[PDB]
Write a protein that binds this ligand. Structure first.
Ligand SMILES: Nc1ncnc2c1ncn2[C@@H]1O[C@H](COP(=O)(O)OP(=O)(O)OC[C@H]2O[C@@H](O)[C@H](O)[C@@H]2O)[C@@H](O)[C@H]1OP(=O)(O)O
Ligand SMILES: Nc1ncnc2c1ncn2[C@@H]1O[C@H](COP(=O)(O)OP(=O)(O)OC[C@H]2O[C@@H](O)[C@H](O)[C@@H]2O)[C@@H](O)[C@H]1OP(=O)(O)O
Ligand SMILES: Nc1nc2c(ncn2[C@@H]2O[C@H](COP(=O)(O)OP(=O)(O)O[C@H]3O[C@H](CO)[C@@H](O)[C@H](O)[C@@H]3O)[C@@H](O)[C@H]2O)c(=O)[nH]1
Ligand SMILES: Nc1nc2c(ncn2[C@@H]2O[C@H](COP(=O)(O)OP(=O)(O)O[C@H]3O[C@H](CO)[C@@H](O)[C@H](O)[C@@H]3O)[C@@H](O)[C@H]2O)c(=O)[nH]1
Lengths: 309, 309
């Protein structure tokens, strides 16, 4: 009946809160933005790095569910901020887990991991299933791999109720800049608004990612909390690989001016996973989840968001 | 040739320093205690958690080799100090790597990892080789798995010269208390000296570990520095599994007096790897290394160290 979402003012957070409120769940959300407000959410000021405040907030609210979304979410920025990505993602998670363990709460925690935990996938391994070797290629990936490992250990050592996800690329209106669909859509609309030369600036167009709309993601998170098996890991993904080139092409075909493409070398990463496509069989079998929103719709709605801003 | 050993005043460090000085390597060593001192080592005061002081030391010395041993080495203690084990092992390592990166030094770094990175190994996987998946069971294991992943990433992203070890249990005279062969030997000699009732307090006797004498370990580290392949991971182990029961029985057979055995529940860990036995084939093939000192001899010399004060 009672859910706590850390990082509720983030991209996924707002959609998740909306989704839970519609399932008649009482929603509490935490953020560092002491002015942030969300419809039907009790908002709580919390820095996930303040271990004693994490333990106070969780002790006060006594949630039945925690969806732990507070994190440094950028792969790109983890190269520059390796330690900060690790302190926030690993230690923030530990503070949450230790709060529950200490309060001895009857609570299920969903920890949010990443397809970056897999990293380099052997061609024979794709689409990747949950038993696949973890070979992270980015510092972010190392942080999420550590979160997952600790999740499993807390289940084993302390009898806790934790489910870890490995979420693949998630997209939709409201995602911050620094992520590919936002970075591209934003330039396109600026070009339409004659605020930028008709030339779009891009990074690596050869990468392949598995994209799912944030609205489908939060349904999967809800369903996992309800039907998932304690201590299991679940891929949350569409099972379809799209080249970044084709994400760009889909977006450009929706623009109402002709647009040239140009390499921006500051968008390249020191090392990157060339391809990530996941198997969602475990998730589908456990929950009856299916993605519903096609990539084309997601991308169009992102363009619409910038256009109406 | 100049070598820098971090954590030089630790168990492995003192032996490694002695070994390197015998190879006509100029040895510089770091420790947090300013009242240390080692034959033929230039001692430097350094806390590995001080990123700017780490850079300064590495900038000053301009070493050809760094043997990075500074760490929180206890698996037992990692359950109580999860964040400290993480900050020291992962961030300490990042400080070293970034210092070398910044100074653009022509330097090979040996990062020291652990069989705890493997964790739970399937019977068909034993003895484990370096491509086995990582399924750590202890927070310590997560910290070392992260060190290894990051070492591989710095090679790939930045073109650095780094070799990572996965070292299995290492033993010998001078190891601190809190590790099994020391905890057992100390009590036996205290019992011989009539300082303790003839009952030894012990933890889990059913665990299996792969033991190698520290004098052999440091030869492996030296040889890897010379002959190892950049970006490769090497198990450093004997390939022989010994039950802790049998470790104890070997020690009791060497004692003066009949000694009974009793469980001390405080020696039990929340969750533990039942069995770790490694393949040393990659190391032997690359370097010609072989373990020379039998387990019985290591255990004997440990007892002698307590008996001789
Ligand atoms: N020290 C912290 N204490 C409390 N919250 C923190 C702290 N550091 C960061 N966050 C928050 O986490 C939220 C993460 O949201 P987004 O960056 O928009 O990511 P998204 O909602 O797409 O991803 C949610 C989860 O899904 C994963 O992909 C990602 O790593 C994360 O675990 C942000 O609002 C971010 O908030 P802020 O914008 O830094 O104030
Ligand atoms: N923040 C720190 N800054 C500088 N040094 C540090 C810091 N934290 C710990 N150390 C040192 O690392 C040394 C590690 O030595 P032992 O605990 O005796 O471990 P051992 O020498 O058996 O193992 C060497 C390597 O092999 C692995 O077993 C272990 O994780 C480590 O990576 C200790 O002298 C330990 O010294 P101290 O007793 O904690 O002062
Ligand atoms: N951001 C960005 N990415 C670009 C650009 N050009 C090409 N790309 C490429 O587009 C791909 C997706 O990058 P991002 O959208 O930044 O996300 P990510 O690095 O894959 O990480 C996202 O997905 C993970 C799940 O796999 C999430 O765990 C993570 O938090 C994030 O949402 C990457 O291969 C990136 O190099 C650009 O201009 N901007
Ligand atoms: N310390 C200790 N261990 C005991 C005792 N009784 C049983 N044990 C068991 O003896 C085994 C060895 O434990 P330790 O000597 O504490 O070492 P460890 O946890 O295996 O870790 C050591 O080896 C790793 C390499 O695999 C190293 O990475 C790590 O730094 C450390 O040296 C474990 O299964 C432990 O539970 C006891 O009284 N004391």
């Amino acid at each position: 009946m009672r859910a706590l979402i850390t990082g509720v003012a983030g991209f996924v957070g707002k959609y998740l809160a909306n989704h839970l409120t519609e399932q008649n769940v009482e929603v509490f959300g935490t953020s560092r933005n002491n002015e942030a407000k969300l419809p039907n959410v009790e908002m709580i000021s919390l820095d996930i790095m303040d271990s004693q405040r994490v333990k106070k907030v969780i002790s006060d609210i006594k949630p039945d569910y925690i969806f732990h979304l507070a994190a440094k979410s950028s792969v790109k920025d983890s190269w520059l901020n390796k330690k900060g990505t690790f302190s926030t993602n690993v230690f923030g998670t530990l503070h949450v887990l230790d709060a529950v363990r200490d309060s001895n709460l009857d609570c299920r925690i969903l920890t949010i991991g990443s397809s970056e935990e897999y990293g380099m996938i052997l061609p024979e391994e794709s689409p990747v299933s949950e038993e696949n070797q973890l070979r992270p290629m980015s510092p972010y990936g190392v942080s999420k791999a550590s979160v997952g490992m600790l999740a499993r250990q807390y289940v084993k050592a302390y009898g806790m109720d934790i489910i870890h996800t490995r979420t693949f690329n998630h997209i939709g209106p409201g995602q911050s800049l620094g992520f590919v669909t936002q970075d591209f859509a934003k330039q396109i609309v600026d070009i339409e608004m004659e605020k930028q030369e008709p030339i779009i600036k891009v990074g690596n167009l050869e990468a392949v990612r598995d994209f799912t709309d944030v609205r489908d993601i939060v349904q999967a998170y809800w369903l996992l909390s309800q039907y998932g098996k304690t201590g299991d890991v679940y891929n949350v993904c569409s099972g379809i690989g799209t080249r970044i080139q084709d994400v760009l092409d889909l977006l450009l075909a929706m623009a109402n001016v002709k647009i040239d493409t140009e390499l921006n070398p500051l968008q390249l990463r020191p090392s990157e996973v060339p391809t990530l496509i996941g198997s969602n069989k475990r998730l589908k079998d456990s929950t009856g989840w299916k993605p519903r929103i096609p990539l084309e719709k997601s991308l169009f709605e992102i363009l619409q968001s910038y256009r109406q801003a």
